[PDB]
Amino acid sequence: NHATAPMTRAPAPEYVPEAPRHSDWQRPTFAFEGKGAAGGHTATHHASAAPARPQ
Amino acid sequence: MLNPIVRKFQYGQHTVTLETGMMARQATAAVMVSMDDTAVFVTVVGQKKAKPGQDFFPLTVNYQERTYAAGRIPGSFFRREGRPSEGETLIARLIDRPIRPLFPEGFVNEVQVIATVVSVNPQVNPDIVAMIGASAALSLSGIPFNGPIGAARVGYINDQYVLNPTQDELKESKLDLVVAGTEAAVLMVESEAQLLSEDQMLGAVVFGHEQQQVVIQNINELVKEAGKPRWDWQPEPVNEALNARVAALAEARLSDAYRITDKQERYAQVDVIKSETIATLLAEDETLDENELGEILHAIEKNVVRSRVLAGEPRIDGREKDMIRGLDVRTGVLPRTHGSALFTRGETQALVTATLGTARDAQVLDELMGERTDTFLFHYNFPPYSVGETGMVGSPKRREIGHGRLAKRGVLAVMPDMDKFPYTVRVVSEITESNGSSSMASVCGASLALMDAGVPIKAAVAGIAMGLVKEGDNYVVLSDILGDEDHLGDMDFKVAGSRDGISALQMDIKIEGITKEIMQVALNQAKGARLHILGVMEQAINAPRGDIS
Amino acid sequence: MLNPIVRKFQYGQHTVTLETGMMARQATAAVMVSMDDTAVFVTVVGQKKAKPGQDFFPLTVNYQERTYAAGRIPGSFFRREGRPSEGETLIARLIDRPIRPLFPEGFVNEVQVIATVVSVNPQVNPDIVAMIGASAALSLSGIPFNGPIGAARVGYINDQYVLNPTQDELKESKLDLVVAGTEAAVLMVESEAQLLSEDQMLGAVVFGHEQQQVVIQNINELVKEAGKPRWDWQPEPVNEALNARVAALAEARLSDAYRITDKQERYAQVDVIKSETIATLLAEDETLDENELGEILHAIEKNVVRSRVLAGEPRIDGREKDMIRGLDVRTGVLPRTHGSALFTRGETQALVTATLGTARDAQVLDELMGERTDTFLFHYNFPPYSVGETGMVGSPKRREIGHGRLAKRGVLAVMPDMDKFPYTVRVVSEITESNGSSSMASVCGASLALMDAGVPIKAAVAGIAMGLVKEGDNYVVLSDILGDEDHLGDMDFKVAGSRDGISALQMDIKIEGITKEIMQVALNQAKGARLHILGVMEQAINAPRGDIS
Amino acid sequence: MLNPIVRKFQYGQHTVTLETGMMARQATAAVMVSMDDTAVFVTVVGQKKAKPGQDFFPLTVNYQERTYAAGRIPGSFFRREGRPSEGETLIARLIDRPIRPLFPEGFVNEVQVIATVVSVNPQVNPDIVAMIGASAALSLSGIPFNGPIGAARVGYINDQYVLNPTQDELKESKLDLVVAGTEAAVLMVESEAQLLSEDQMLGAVVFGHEQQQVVIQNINELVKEAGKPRWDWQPEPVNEALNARVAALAEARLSDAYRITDKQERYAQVDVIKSETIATLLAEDETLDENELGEILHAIEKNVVRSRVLAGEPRIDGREKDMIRGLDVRTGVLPRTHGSALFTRGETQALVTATLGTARDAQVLDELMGERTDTFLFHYNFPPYSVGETGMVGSPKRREIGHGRLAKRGVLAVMPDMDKFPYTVRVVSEITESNGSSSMASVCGASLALMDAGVPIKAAVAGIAMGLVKEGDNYVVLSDILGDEDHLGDMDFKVAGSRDGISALQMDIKIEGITKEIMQVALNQAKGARLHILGVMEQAINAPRGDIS
């Protein structure tokens, strides 16, 4: 239930380059049908008025 | 033993008891006010020495509701009352608004008013009792205070004005107006109405002002019997010589600078004038403080602006007194919200959203006067970047709560009744720019978002923040006040409503002289402004856009 | 009236829209970013004058998630979003980590970045949108900012890298990595994985970096179209004469002091040198600041340590580049706890406990992207006495929450499936001593505690925190960095995992020139360190015991 | 690597293990105390340099309970322990009280003691183990500390004293006393009893003091074996010349100012003498500090009062040693509360309300030992106006919680059993004025309110706050000590109870030499005081009304 260890050197292991992996999977395309944008250029209704005095 | 002093009078259908001299004898003043069976204990402690180098007046009003007043054990996890709720904060703000302007100028001692609801009658609201207690305690304390204030609540039932209506009467009332004022003039009005006219909403203010004189007179009698000696406080003497110096240096130059029609150049020139004057004076005598010189320069600038406005000259933005800023209305901005709207008035912008839910989403509030189910939830978010500043987020102040409540009151009159629309509606209003009244843009944005979501509201509501500057017999009403024009507001009113009536009214009068006729002129100009804004709004969305729940 | 500038482009499978110039026009910059239907509104405000005598750079990033973005009314008692949650804090830290190193040296003006999520597509995470809206806002504002940064999330499905996986693809992914980088170098990596190799993780950092370029190019085009003029900020001039005098007076003495092997006497001599230099310079001139002299001494000290480390000399504690500190593993230290462990690496100690609960103790989180039940909870307490100082207790700041999340990421890969182990597990890590990476000692302590509690974890996991120092083409990778080697960290990386593969990786690069071969050498040295630590841990307990509760 | 030092001894029916030297080696001291599986890790950190200008000792004690100790995942929504609970704050104050007087006079270095419960046997209470851990850590640290303390809990079962009664034993016991003390004197006593005599409550203090000596001896041996070297700390030298000059200028003047009766004229004369002496010295030499003169004057005034009291002269308010302030009792002061009372003693006034509820209103506490249901709730509100000050309302400090707990201990002994009264009772006490013992006024008001509300309490209970002043062999016991007589309290004790026994006892002794005869005299005088208050109180109300709910 106990284990100690002195101040020891942990040398880096020998490196072995990986063999390039091959896959055939094709990622399914994302189905999104919507406005997408969320700023004010997306407004469905827009009205504006210049600085004015009540009629 | 202890000897209490008790004064009883008749306020409408209620009996009001003011008791003093027995409880909290180590405070500046303490009053127990009991209207029927609603008893509130109000205490005022005022510090006799001001802090060195103290600029603003520190006034703190706390309002606390104790659950044992209703004979109930609090239902919180710890079974104990905690941080003030929203309603308590709102009532503390309500009490603070009238009393604050009534402390003499130059008074900077620290004053804390604490109101505690110690007993509640379910049919008598404790906020008016708390206001009466605050006025009585501040009048019996000795602290320099200019006159007792009264407080009244007015409702409109069967086409008649009723004073301090009960909750049962308030359920059949088309009005709920709180009016506070001194003997001479009205000082604060906060109201909510079901699309009432301007004459109908001014009659209530007049009626409640006339009916609160009994409270004012009885508080005066109580102060005569059992009032503490008046504080020997004198305002710090003004440096007339320094005010002259700076006036002769910069007043005419600032007045000439204010004829400049461009904002950037005019402000740059104003800063140049200030820097040159502070340089000169500072060099002449090193003793002179720079902060006081800056304050004098600010006062001179404010006086110049007031003189221009009252002389008929263009405002600090080039506008006239009856001109509204530019409007931009958009609906349908956010892609996945139930309803959304962007409302821009000049440089005040609000992005408001509306969300629909079921009955499970309705808020349940455990209140002293009774449990309530809120199916319309209005929330208000005022982030720092709205004013171009850096600060802490997610910690609403008392201002943003009073503003959220005012916007909710403005929109509440047109909301559909439960039978037609059986859902819960949450409106969230984020203020993206603030150079004026963000709460009234919140009301317009809320109307637009509620129509975009599909809520079958009765009519579209818009709000306008107006101001009135008086000097002698000359007054000017200013439409669509900015945030840099606050000093110009002798009366600052915010009116919300539809094309047919007022749905919420908030006035804050700080001077004496504003008669009823002046108020009619101001509310007719505000009506014209609101109808302009509503016309612009209807050009975008004109009826609820049906949508999902 | 209002004319917004809009830029749309294609990011992998989604459409990203950046809109600016219409909302929040009083902020330094404001951008609305929409990826598919996820929309985040990001605003940056920077103060134009630094605070008198400010030493550090105040940068605040606030990330807010609004429930109405999901079309839901919040389920809290007040029906309002309150203080930021753990997820929002973690996302804000994710935004903060890549941008802080990109402000020029000497820049101390205050900058606040507020990112509010205003719409959510349930399949699109808003954090990448928030980091591309913070990059866009910071690039349009004109505040000195050395480059637009991009962000990319990478997953690993069917042995192929996937750019920005949806929330349905992340269930089948073996990886979840967030790379944030500039156009020239990678700056932040935050990743969890199911025991992947080091080549599989580096190829992911290179994939995410080679995908961010699109985002960066489009932000550069938007800045050209509608970017504010750049600030005229210039760094405060350095006192070259003062630095030269202090160097000529103390550099050789400090270099000699660091050749001493003993720590306490070296600290005493360094303090003697500092005091004598301060006294000498104050005698030469009284006006010289004390804190400025202390900072100059500290800078010389840091340059001395860096010079010694890069030249092959032993570190400040006598260790070599790849040497690990002494280890100590104790299991079963608390009597009445389900599982417990004490892990010590040199002077970094952690006491970690594991508690077993029933399925009703699982935490239910109503996150903006859905409702999630978590059956593995990790909590990380960093008390002040771990660094030998007095301070506030029980308040977890942002770094503590981030370290807890990193440790949970490090252990999440070996946790048993709900079929094998149908119980809830809470792991609490108390940092008893901190002179290194406490978050990586928490991983080892959690592994030991989970094997002591009897949880059938797939394999033991340990972690190591390392650093890389680079000067020109000369680099040194340091294993098990201390708390006094933070300056030496041109690259600070933390690698956790089992004997087979990496389960969590975090990198914070602050320099340019780190190619792929440097990162491979760094993570192969980290592999060796992990293997040593895991072997020592294995000598204490090699498999879960038999227990259930 | 690590070499832990372990000291085991036998404490009654339990084994105490003190382990040090392995955990938290960066704190000034850290110990792990375990009593029969209950384990509490206690750490102390002390700063070696005091901040210049420190006038008060900055001691912080934090007590934390971890749910993992009991093997449970916390039931909070976040599944993490939040702010300290009421019990945790009470235990932290319990640890704080006996260790503050033991630091030397003039020690202003900042010290923080953190006690975290890491394992809990449901039958062994973690509070005596936390007190032992705090004493051991402070003795091991080397910080100037005038002696180790021991703690013990005494119970009364079958007319026999029992050391450290278990949670099962504490059910049949008529007493629950916590006595902490050094080798030579008793420092702290906090006890609740079921109406026991004075000999029965002093015998317990003596027993607990005589049984906790093994803890002191074992801590002494542990410190000898593994203690840190003692701090080289010396108090700042006393400016004897300034003290002598101030004395020769003002001592006779102050001693003779106190001979006049009227409080206001005496205050005026005191301030006059102060101003003249301070001004004269300040003019003579300018280097003299204003605050130093003020403190030396305060100290001389305190010595004047002390000498007068010890010499037999009337107290500051003109009362004798055994005289109780004037009493006023009122019942039914609030209209719509279930029960209410106003209790005034001199200038200490409390408004107390009792509310009756059903069993659903009982508070469910998830404590470490087990889930508890509390049907008697006591809340204590100390607003800022009670002392004539301004400040935060609704924040309960540690003292406002300890006082509420003491009042609840005082009233708990006479509360009706669940069978006879099956309802939940909440008593709330607002301290309207405070110039004495607010907690004893709270006890009196709670008795009055409970009888007004109709609760069938076994008897009426009242409390008295007492003090003892000692010099050599001469001592004077002072009844109903005022808020300005705190300095005049070598022993401060607060005895509550009925006409036939004591229900609560709190003692804080700051001197040595308090033998058992002295305590006999002090508690007999306290009995006479309590019986006077109870008789005055009986006239207003003598039995509970028949008003159930």
Residue numbers in the entry:
A (entry chain D): 1004 to 1058
B (entry chain A), C (entry chain B), D (entry chain C): 1 to 549
What does the paper behind this entry write?
At the core of the assembly is the endoribonuclease RNase E, which initiates turnover of most messenger RNA (mRNA) transcripts and processes precursors of ribosomal RNAs, transfer RNAs, and small regulatory RNAs (sRNAs). Notwithstanding, PNPase predominantly acts as phosphorolytic 3′ → 5′ exoribonuclease that catalyses the processive degradation of single-stranded RNA, involved both in mRNA decay and sRNA-mediated gene regulation. Beyond the residues that form the catalytic core (1–529), each protomer of RNase E presents an intrinsically disordered C-terminal domain (CTD), extending from residues 530–1061, that serves as a scaffold for the RNA degradosome.
Purified RNase E 921–1061-muGFP peptide was combined in molar excess with the PNPase core, and the complex structurally characterized by cryo-EM. Several rounds of focused 3D-classification and focused 3D-refinement resulted in a cryo-EM map at overall 2.6 Å resolution, allowing an atomic model to be built for the PNPase core:RNase E complex using the automated model building tool ModelAngelo. The cryo-EM map is well-defined for the RNase E peptide from residue 1003 to residue 1057, therefore, only these residues were built in the atomic model. The model confirms the presence of the β-strand between residues 1048–1053 (β1 strand), and a second β-strand was identified and built, formed by the strongly conserved residues 1005 – 1008 (β2 strand), and similar to the residues forming β1 strand. First, the β-strands resemble one another both in length, sequence and interaction pattern: His1005 on β2 strand and His1049 on β1 strand interact with the Asp328 present on the β-sheet of one PNPase protomer (Bix). In particular, Arg1056 form polar interactions with PNPase residues, namely Glu322 and Asp320. Each Arg in the two proline motifs, namely Arg1056 from the β1 motif (1053–1061) and Arg1012 from the β2 motif (1009–1017) form three salt bridges with different residues on PNPase, suggesting that Arg1012 and Arg1056 are key residues for the interaction with PNPase.
